[PDB]
Amino acid sequence: GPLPDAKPLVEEATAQTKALKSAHMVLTVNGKIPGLSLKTLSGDLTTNPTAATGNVKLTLGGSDIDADFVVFDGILYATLTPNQWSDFGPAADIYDPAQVLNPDTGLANVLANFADAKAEGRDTINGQNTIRISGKVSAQAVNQIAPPFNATQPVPATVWIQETGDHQLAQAQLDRGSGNSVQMTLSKWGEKVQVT
Ligand SMILES: CCCCCCCCCCCCCCCC(=O)OCC(COC(=O)CCCCCCCCCCCCCCC)OC(=O)CCCCCCCCCCCCCCC
């Protein structure tokens, strides 16, 4: 049947995202984004205070490493060899994961700077009906959430917003062209992170 108007849905998702404290996130990098050596990540994030835990697949020196990670008390830790925790210092010197849910600079700021929104279709994301929406995100909003994009123009993007219910952002993708793109799927909004 007919699609809703994207614009009110984006506005509603913006407000919902600003109110978020925590979520489960799955992040995938498709192709190659210069200065991003991550391939995948899956984890749980809470904010105020910031903590995160999960697993990451990343490339270091031409090799893919699977690692568990914890961010706790500003500090990033990861197991670059199995069951061995290394301390990598302040998480903020690499990337503070709270930035993803910062209401001024994170996903909500992406949504508020998502231009030309148009509903394209319906898709299931994690068992929920969502509206797939195309648009373009400002360079400045992209660079603030994902510095390695190094955008000097608007970035084509797709968002998937819950059709009913709370209208959360279920998924977002930023396309750097060719077959190079970053996507995040969010779920379990307001989960207790558990702790670390
Ligand atoms: C809608 C889309 C939403 C997108 C939201 C998030 C987008 C991603 C944010 C961009 C990350 C920017 C961080 C710098 C990029 C980096 O990779 O450095 C490149 C250097 C090579 O680049 C350079 O040459 C120099 C950069 C200096 C980096 C120093 C590295 C020190 C080595 C030790 C790190 C190993 C532990 C990492 C475990 C995570 O080699 C490295 O890869 C080593 C560092 C790996 C960092 C992984 C960052 C994790 C992203 C977390 C956000 C996801 C949400 C979290 C939810 C829980």
Author numbering: 36 to 231
Task: Please give me the paper's original passages concerning this structure.
Rv1411c encodes the mycobacterial lipoprotein LprG, which can bind triacylated phospholipids such as phosphatidylinositol mannoside (PIM) and lipoarabinomannan (LAM) and is necessary for normal surface display of LAM. However, unlike other known mycobacterial lipoproteins, LprG is in an operon with a putative integral membrane transporter, Rv1410, a member of the major facilitator superfamily (MFS). LprG binds TAG within a large hydrophobic cleft and is sufficient to transfer TAG from donor to acceptor membranes. Thus, we identify LprG as a physiologically important TAG transporter.
Previous work on the structure of LprG revealed a large central cavity that can accommodate triacylated lipid species, including triacylated phosphatidylinositol (Ac1PIM2). Briefly, the alpha-beta fold is maintained and consists of 10 anti-parallel ß-strands apposed by 6 α-helices that define a central cavity whose entrance is lined by multiple loops. The TAG glyceryl group is located at this entrance between loops L1 (aa 65–72) and L2 (aa 95–98). Compared to the position of Ac1PIM2 bound to LprG, the orientation of TAG is conserved: the hydrophilic glyceryl headgroup interacts with Ser72 at the cavity entrance. The acyl chains form interactions with the side chains of hydrophobic residues within the cavity. However, while the three acyl chains of Ac1PIM2 are all bound within the cavity, only two of the TAG palmitoyl chains (sn1 and sn2) are similarly buried; the third acyl chain (sn3) is exposed to the solvent. The first ten carbons of the sn3 palmitoyl chain form van der Waals contacts with the hydrophobic sidechains at the cavity entrance, including Leu95, Leu115, Phe123 and Ile129. The lid of the cavity, composed of a helix-loop motif (α2-loop1- α3-loop2), is flexible and was found in two conformations that define distinct cavity volumes. The volume of the open form with TAG bound is 1425 Å3 and the closed form is 895 Å3 due to a major inward movement of the cavity lid (aa 129–134). Comparing the helix-loop motif in the closed and open forms, the side chain of Tyr130 blocks the binding site for the sn2-palmitoyl chain of TAG.
